[PDB]
Design a protein around this ligand. Structure first.
Ligand SMILES: O=C(O)CNC(=O)C(=O)O
Ligand SMILES: [Mg+2]
Ligand code: NI
Ligand SMILES: [Zn+2]
Length: 331
């Protein structure tokens, strides 16, 4: 078995190997990359996502989210308070202000220490989940707006044509902006490209050990657990590496820098934080290997998780027993 310790693997494809996306994902899996839940892909030196980032300031962040924490430094939840619209140029200036900017630090480890010590005492503002793309239309390789769709994968594998679409999303971050512990909708893959700015630190639990994280989460968030049998779908709970280590949960960490891709694999729980002003683009995708994970994915039916139009068909076809109850949650 390849990668039996479930380490995060880092790949350096050549420009030739960067042509065929599906083939390269299958290659990484042949080497055991999925066992980690997360892999890094450094693009060939010849590749670029677009020519420059000099003209992005007028993108609108219609609903910036203030991430307010509750709990203790290592075990907390966050809620998202909606703020007034602002442009990316306005948001960059805010991220660089004295109130929100990255503090002085020695290295990524010192910054990580500061994040876990101090996150709860601040409420950073995240421009998340913005439909759109920063890839130039002429970028042919690993263009996250030109991937094969999940609906087409399901049709190819299973023969059933379904409604729905699959487009990318932009994320504008600042120091301390946080992504809570989660797997993807329907335990899909994700791919995330850090277009510009400061790094993003990731934490990940191997898919084979995801239920250990779930059991810890039920213990740490006991009211949320009684409220919903899949409350990590709400995407609000944070647990620090120190707490994970104290409770014996297998996990790994890595820092993504600008110009790098990350892939999350089906049922790979992940969480993390941004180091400073940045912009990422991410989208879900599927492969043949996903179908079995899609069939077994948990679902939130309490009503909190509320997701896209396109998830309907995935539930309806892959999980017809759950359909009814999950749709009640969605309406
Ligand atoms: O970058 C973020 O805030 C969160 N991204 C992801 O969870 C992802 O790409 O799967
Ligand atoms: Mg612009
Ligand atoms: Ni994710
Ligand atoms: Zn729920």
């Amino acid at each position: 078995a390849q990668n039996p310790n479930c380490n995060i693997m880092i790949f350096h494809p050549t420009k030739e190997e960067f042509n065929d996306f599906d083939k390269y994902i299958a290659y990484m899996e042949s080497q055991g990359a999925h066992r980690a839940g997360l892999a890094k892909i450094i693009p060939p030196k010849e590749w670029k996502a677009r020519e420059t980032y000099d003209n992005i300031s007028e993108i609108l962040i219609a609903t910036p989210l203030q991430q307010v924490a509750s709990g203790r430094a290592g075990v907390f939840t966050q809620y998202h308070k909606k703020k007034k619209a602002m442009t990316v140029g306005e948001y960059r200036h805010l991220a660089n202000s004295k109130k929100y900017q990255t503090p002085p630090h020695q290295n990524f480890e010192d910054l990580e220490r500061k994040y876990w010590k101090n996150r709860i005492y601040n409420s950073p503002i995240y421009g998340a989940d913005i439909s759109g793309s920063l890839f130039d239309e002429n970028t042919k390789q690993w263009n996250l707006g030109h991937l094969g769709t999940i609906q087409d994968l399901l049709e190819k594998e299973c023969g059933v044509v379904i409604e729905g679409v699959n487009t990318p999303y932009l994320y504008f971050g600042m120091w301390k902006t946080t992504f809570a512990w989660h797997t993807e909708d329907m335990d899909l893959y994700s791919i995330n490209y850090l277009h510009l700015g400061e790094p993003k630190t990731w934490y990940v639990v191997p898919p084979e050990h995801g239920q250990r994280l779930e059991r810890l989460a039920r213990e740490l968030f006991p009211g949320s657990s009684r409220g919903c049998g899949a409350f990590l779908r709400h995407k609000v709970a944070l647990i620090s590496p120190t707490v994970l280590k104290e409770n014996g949960i297998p996990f790994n960490r890595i820092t993504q820098e600008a110009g790098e891709f990350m892939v999350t694999f089906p049922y790979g729980y992940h969480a993390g934080f941004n180091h400073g002003f940045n912009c990422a683009e991410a989208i879900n995708f599927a492969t043949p290997r996903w179908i079995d994970y899609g069939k077994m994915a948990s679902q939130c039916s309490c009503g909190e998780a509320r997701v896209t139009f396109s998830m309907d068909a995935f539930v309806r076809i892959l999980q017809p027993e759950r359909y009814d109850l999950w749709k009640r949650g969605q309406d």
